[PDB]
Amino acid sequence: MNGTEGPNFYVPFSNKTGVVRSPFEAPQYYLAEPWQFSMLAAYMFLLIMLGFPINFLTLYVTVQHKKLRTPLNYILLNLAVADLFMVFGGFTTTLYTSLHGYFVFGPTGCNLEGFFATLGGEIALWSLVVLAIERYVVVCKPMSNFRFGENHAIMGVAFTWVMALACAAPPLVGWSRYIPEGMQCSCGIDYYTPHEETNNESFVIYMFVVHFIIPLIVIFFCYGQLVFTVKEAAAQQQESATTQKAEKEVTRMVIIMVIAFLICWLPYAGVAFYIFTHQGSDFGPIFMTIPAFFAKTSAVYNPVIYIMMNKQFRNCMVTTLCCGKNPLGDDEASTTVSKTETSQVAPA
Amino acid sequence: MNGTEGPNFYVPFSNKTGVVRSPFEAPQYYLAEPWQFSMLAAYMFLLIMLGFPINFLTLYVTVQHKKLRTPLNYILLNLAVADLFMVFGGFTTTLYTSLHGYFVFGPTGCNLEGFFATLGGEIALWSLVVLAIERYVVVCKPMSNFRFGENHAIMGVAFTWVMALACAAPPLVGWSRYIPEGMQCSCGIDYYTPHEETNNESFVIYMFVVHFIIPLIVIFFCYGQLVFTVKEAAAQQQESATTQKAEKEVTRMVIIMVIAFLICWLPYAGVAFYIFTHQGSDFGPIFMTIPAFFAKTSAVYNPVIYIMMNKQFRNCMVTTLCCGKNPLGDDEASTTVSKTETSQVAPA
Ligand SMILES: *[C@@H]1O[C@H](CO)[C@@H](O[C@@H]2O[C@H](CO)[C@@H](O[C@@H]3O[C@H](CO)[C@@H](O)[C@H](O[C@@H]4O[C@H](CO)[C@@H](O)[C@H](O)[C@@H]4O)[C@@H]3O)[C@H](O)[C@H]2NC(C)=O)[C@H](O)[C@H]1NC(C)=O
Ligand SMILES: *[C@@H]1O[C@H](CO)[C@@H](O[C@@H]2O[C@H](CO)[C@@H](O[C@H]3O[C@H](CO)[C@@H](O)[C@H](O)[C@@H]3O)[C@H](O)[C@H]2NC(C)=O)[C@H](O)[C@H]1NC(C)=O
Ligand SMILES: *[C@@H]1O[C@H](CO)[C@@H](O[C@@H]2O[C@H](CO)[C@@H](O)[C@H](O)[C@H]2NC(C)=O)[C@H](O)[C@H]1NC(C)=O
Ligand SMILES: *[C@@H]1O[C@H](CO)[C@@H](O[C@@H]2O[C@H](CO)[C@@H](O)[C@H](O)[C@H]2NC(C)=O)[C@H](O)[C@H]1NC(C)=O
Ligand SMILES: *C/C=C(C)/C=C/C=C(C)/C=C/C1=C(C)CCCC1(C)C
Ligand SMILES: *C/C=C(C)/C=C/C=C(C)/C=C/C1=C(C)CCCC1(C)C
Ligand SMILES: CCCCCCCS[C@@H]1O[C@H](CO)[C@@H](O)[C@H](O)[C@H]1O
Ligand SMILES: CCCCCCCS[C@@H]1O[C@H](CO)[C@@H](O)[C@H](O)[C@H]1O
Ligand SMILES: CCCCCCCS[C@@H]1O[C@H](CO)[C@@H](O)[C@H](O)[C@H]1O
Ligand SMILES: CCCCCCCS[C@@H]1O[C@H](CO)[C@@H](O)[C@H](O)[C@H]1O
Ligand SMILES: [Hg+2]
Ligand SMILES: [Hg+2]
Ligand SMILES: [Hg+2]
Ligand SMILES: [Hg+2]
Ligand SMILES: [Hg+2]
Ligand SMILES: [Hg+2]
Ligand SMILES: [Zn+2]
Ligand SMILES: [Zn+2]
Ligand SMILES: [Zn+2]
Ligand SMILES: [Zn+2]
Ligand SMILES: [Zn+2]
Ligand SMILES: [Zn+2]
Ligand SMILES: [Zn+2]
C-alpha cells in the first residue's frame, strides 16, 4: 500500500519499514526533517502575530466609527471576526501541533484545527457571493428605489454563517470527518478514505458542489453582469457623479477580493480534489502541506486589501490609531466617520 | 537624457514625453501601474504590523527577564529598538507615500524615510562587528581572566549608535542628501547625481569604505579566527563542557545573523553601487525598488533568528506569553529566570 490508513488517519507514507505512527500519538519526523516542522511552527507563529492585530484593529475601527455601516462595512466586520476565530480557534492548535510534530490533543485538536479553517474559508467564500449580489444590485440596480439597509447587511452576514456552518459543522457530527494532512500538522475533510461508516464520499461531493462550484458560478456570472456596466476603468472625481465614481471603487475591490480568494484556495482545493480522485495513490507529505498551509493566509489578506483599497476605512483607521483624530492622509475627500468627531450624520 | 534630474531628485524615467513630475509634487503612476503602488503599500503595512509586535515583544521580554543581560541579549534589544524606529520612524512614511504615489510630505518625509532605514541598517552592520569581537574574545579568548560584562555591552551598544549616526546623520546636515529611489516611494543616499553643491561623490565613497567594506572585512576576518576553534560542528549536551557547547550555539546564531544581513543588503548595496559608477545610464524605477523594499525586511528578520536560534531566550519568552509561569517545553535546561518567578540568580 502507498500509504498507511489508520482508523482515524491516513499517513501519505508507506509503513514497509514499519516506521509509521498514528499522528495522534507520536512525532512524524520520519515524514520530513524536524527543521521543516519548525518552519511550520515559525510560520504559524508569525501568522498569529499578524492575524490577531490586523483583524482586531479592523474590528475595533469598524465598531468605533458609527457611520461605517454599509453592506461592505458589515461583511468585512464579519470577515474580521471569522479571521479571529481562525487565529485563536485553530491556529493555536496548528502551531501547537507543528511544535510537537503531531496532534497531541488527538482528534479534538484536529477538529479545532479543521473546523475553524473551514469555517473561515467558507465564510469568506459565501461573503463573496453576498458582495457579488450587493455589488450587482447597486450597479445594475434591479429596483428603481431600493437600498440595502443595515438589516439586509445583517441578513447577508447571518446567511454566510448558516452556509459555512452547513459545510463546517457536519464533519464533527458523523458526516465525513476531519483528518490530518501533509506533514500531519493540519486537518481537513476526508478525501483520502471512503470510510462508509461516516459517509465520506458523499460529503466531499456535497462540499465541492454546494460549497464551491456553485458559489463560484454565481459570483462569476454576477461579474459578467458588471462587465458592460461599472468597469475596472475608474477615472477621477465624479464618473457621472462622485457617487457613481466611488461605486466603481467598491466593485474594483470586491473584484480583487475574489482574485485573492482563488489564489488562496485553488491550489488547496486542487490537490484536495486530485487526492479524492486518486485515493491510495503514491503522493507524499509535502504534496498537501504546501497549499494547506499557504491557504491559511486567508485569515489575513482580506483586511489588507480593505485598508489598501478603501480611503474611508484607512482614514478611519489612521484616525483611530492617531488616538485623537487628524486623519492626515488625503481623507476620503468625501464622507468621513468615527465616534464624537465628524461622525455628524449627513444624509438628506 | 535617460533619466530626469530635478534640483531635489532624479526620476529614472525620460521626460521626452514631458510626463515626468517631482516625486515631491505628484504621483509617479506614469513610472509603474497604480496597482503596483498598492502592492508596495500592502507590503509595508504587513511589515509594520509584524515588525512592531515582534520587536516590541522582544524588547519587553528582555527587560522583563532579569537574566537576559548577556552581550548577545544586549545587542538584540538594541536591534529591537533600532527596528522599532525603522517601523515607526520610517516605514510609516514609506506606506503613506506608496498610498499616494509620491512623497506628499516632500523632502522631510524623504528624510524620515531614508534616515531611519539607514539608521536601522547601519546599527545592524555595526552591532554585527561588536558580535564578531565579543565572539572572538570568547572563542579565541586572547585574555587570561577577562569577562565581557554588561558594561562592555553598553559600550558596544553606544558604539553602534555612534557609527550608525555617523552615516545616517550627515545627509541631513549638508553632506550628501536623501533622494527618492525606484518608483520614488522610498528614499536613499544620492548615488544618482554628483551635486557638488553638497559633495555627493565623496560621501558615497565614505559610506562604501567606512560603513560597508571595513566592517565586512573585520567580521569576515574574525570569522576566520574562529575557523580552527569553535566551528559549525556542535554535538549534544556538551563538546568539552556544556558551557563550551552552549557557546557554539550563540556563535551559529551570530553567523546566521550575518548571512541574513548580507542577503538583505548585498543586493541593495550592489544596485546602489552599480548606479554610482554608471550615473545617468539607462535603468528604470523597478531596478532599485526591489532590492530597496526587500531590504526593509531588516526591521524584522533579526527577532526571528533569535527566537529560532536561542533556546534560552525562546523558553524565557513563552514564559512571558503564558502570562504567569507554565514553562512547559523543557525549560532553558541551564539558566531560566524572568522578572521575579525564576529570576533567582545562581552565578558564582
Ligand atoms: C517634463 O516635461 C514637461 C513638458 O515639457 C514639463 O511640463 C511643465 O511642467 C510644469 C510643472 O511640472 C508646468 O508648470 C506648472 O504649471 C501650473 C499651471 O497649470 C502651475 O500651477 C505650476 O506651479 C504652481 O506653483 C504654485 C506656487 O508654488 C503651487 O501652489 C502649485 O501647486 C504649482 O506648483 C507650474 O508652474 C509647465 O506648464 C509644464 N510645461 C509644459 C511644456 O507643459 C515638466 O515640468 C517636465 N518634468 C520634469 C522635468 O520633471
Ligand atoms: C507499521 O508497522 C509497525 C510494525 O508492524 C507497527 O508497530 C506496532 O505499533 C503498535 C502501536 O499501536 C504496537 O502495539 C502496542 O500497543 C499498545 C501500546 O500502548 C500495547 O498493547 C503494546 O505495547 C503493543 O505492543 C505494536 O507492538 C507495534 N508492532 C511492532 C513494533 O512490530 C506500526 O503501528 C505500523 N504503522 C501503523 C499502521 O501505524
Ligand atoms: C500506488 O501508487 C501508484 C502510483 O500512484 C499506483 O499506480 C498507478 O495505478 C493506476 C491504476 O490504479 C495506473 O493508472 C497508473 O498508471 C499507476 N502508476 C504507476 C506509477 O504505476 C498504484 O495503483 C497505487 N497502489 C494502490 C492501489 O494502493
Ligand atoms: C543613456 O543610457 C545608455 C545605456 O546605458 C548609455 O549608453 C551606454 O554608454 C556607454 C558609454 O558611453 C557605452 O559604453 C555603452 O555601450 C552604452 N550602452 C548601450 C549599449 O547602449 C548612454 O550613455 C546614456 N546617455 C546618457 C544620458 O549619458
Ligand atoms: C490548514 C487548514 C486547512 C487546509 C483548511 C481546510 C479547509 C477545507 C477542507 C476547506 C475546503 C474548501 C474551501 C474553504 C474553499 C472552497 C474549496 C474547498 C471546498 C476545497
Ligand atoms: C527602503 C530604505 C532604503 C533603500 C534604505 C537605504 C539605506 C542606505 C542608504 C543604506 C546603505 C548601506 C547599508 C545600511 C548596508 C551596507 C551597504 C550600504 C552602504 C549600501
Ligand atoms: C492550482 C491547482 C493545483 C492542482 C493540484 C495538482 C495535482 S497534480 C499530481 O501531483 C502528484 C504529486 O505526488 C504527481 O505525482 C502527479 O503526476 C500529478 O499529476
Ligand atoms: C492589498 C491589496 C491591494 C493591492 C492590490 C492592488 C489592487 S488595484 C489598485 O487599487 C488602488 C486603490 O483604490 C487604485 O487607486 C488603483 O487604480 C488600482 O489599480
Ligand atoms: C547583487 C545585485 C547586483 C546588481 C548589479 C547588476 C546590475 S546589471 C545592469 O542593469 C542595467 C539597468 O537595468 C542594464 O541596462 C544593463 O544592461 C545591466 O547589465
Ligand atoms: C507560545 C510561543 C511559541 C514559541 C514556540 C516555542 C517552542 S520551545 C521548545 O519546545 C519543545 C517541546 O514542546 C521543548 O522540548 C524544548 O526544550 C523547547 O525549547
Ligand atoms: Hg458582481
Ligand atoms: Hg491568500
Ligand atoms: Hg473615515
Ligand atoms: Hg567572529
Ligand atoms: Hg533579509
Ligand atoms: Hg526566562
Ligand atoms: Zn471507522
Ligand atoms: Zn459552506
Ligand atoms: Zn472514492
Ligand atoms: Zn490619504
Ligand atoms: Zn541643488
Ligand atoms: Zn555607520
Ligand atoms: Zn560619479
UniProtKB/Swiss-Prot annotation, chains A, B:
Give the stretches traversing the membrane: 37-61, 74-96, 111-133, 153-173, 203-224, 253-274, 287-308
- How does the record classify its membrane topology? Multi-pass membrane protein
What changing residue 282 to C does, per the record, is: Stabilized by a disulfide bond and normal light absorption
Tell me one GO molecular function of this protein.
G protein-coupled photoreceptor activity
Presence of the UniProt keyword Lipoprotein in the record = yes
Q: Which UniProt keywords apply?
A: Acetylation, Cell projection, Chromophore, Disulfide bond, G-protein coupled receptor, Glycoprotein, Lipoprotein, Membrane, Metal-binding, Palmitate, Phosphoprotein, Photoreceptor protein, Receptor, Retinal protein, Sensory transduction, Transducer, Transmembrane, Transmembrane helix, Vision, Zinc
Q: Name one GO biological process term.
A: G protein-coupled opsin signaling pathway
Give the SMART domains listed for this entry. 7TM_GPCR_Srsx
Please tell me in which tissues this protein is expressed: Expressed in rod-shaped photoreceptor cells in the retina that mediate vision in dim light (at protein level).
- Listed GO CC annotations: cell-cell junction; G protein-coupled receptor complex; Golgi membrane; membrane; outer membrane; photoreceptor disc membrane; photoreceptor inner segment membrane; photoreceptor outer segment
Give the location in the cell: Membrane; Cell projection, Cilium, Photoreceptor outer segment
Q: Spell out where the chain is glycosylated.
A: 2, 15
Extracellular topological intervals: 1-36, 97-110, 174-202, 275-286
User: What residue range is the signal peptide?
Assistant: none
Q: Which InterPro entries match?
A: GPCR_opsins, GPCR_Rhodpsn, GPCR_Rhodpsn_7TM, Opsin, Retinal_BS, Rhodopsin, Rhodopsin_N
List of residues that carry N-acetylmethionine: 1
List site positions: Plays an important role in the conformation switch to the active conformation.
113
Instruction: Give start-end ranges for motif 'Ionic lock' involved in activated form stabilization.
Output: 134-136
Q: Specify where the region named Interaction with SAG lies, as residue ranges.
A: 330-348
**Residues modified to Phosphoserine:** 334, 338, 343
Which positions anchor the lipid (S-palmitoyl cysteine)?
322-323
Reported modifications of this chain = Phosphorylated on some or all of the serine and threonine residues present in the C-terminal region. Contains one covalently linked retinal chromophore. Upon light absorption, the covalently bound 11-cis-retinal is converted to all-trans-retinal. After hydrolysis of the Schiff base and release of the covalently bound all-trans-retinal, active rhodopsin is regenerated by binding of a fresh molecule of 11-cis-retinal.
Protein family (similarity comment): Belongs to the G-protein coupled receptor 1 family. Opsin subfamily.
Q: How does it assemble?
A: Homodimer. May form a complex composed of RHO, GRK1 and RCVRN in a Ca(2+)-dependent manner; RCVRN prevents the interaction between GRK1 and RHO. Interacts with GRK1. Interacts (phosphorylated form) with SAG. Interacts with GNAT1. Interacts with GNAT3. SAG and G-proteins compete for a common binding site. Interacts with PRCD; the interaction promotes PRCD stability. Forms a complex with ASAP1 and ARF4. Forms a complex with ASAP1, RAB11A, Rabin8/RAB3IP, ARF4 and RAB11FIP3; the complex regulates Golgi-to-cilia rhodopsin/RHO transport in photoreceptors.
- Listed name of the protein: Rhodopsin
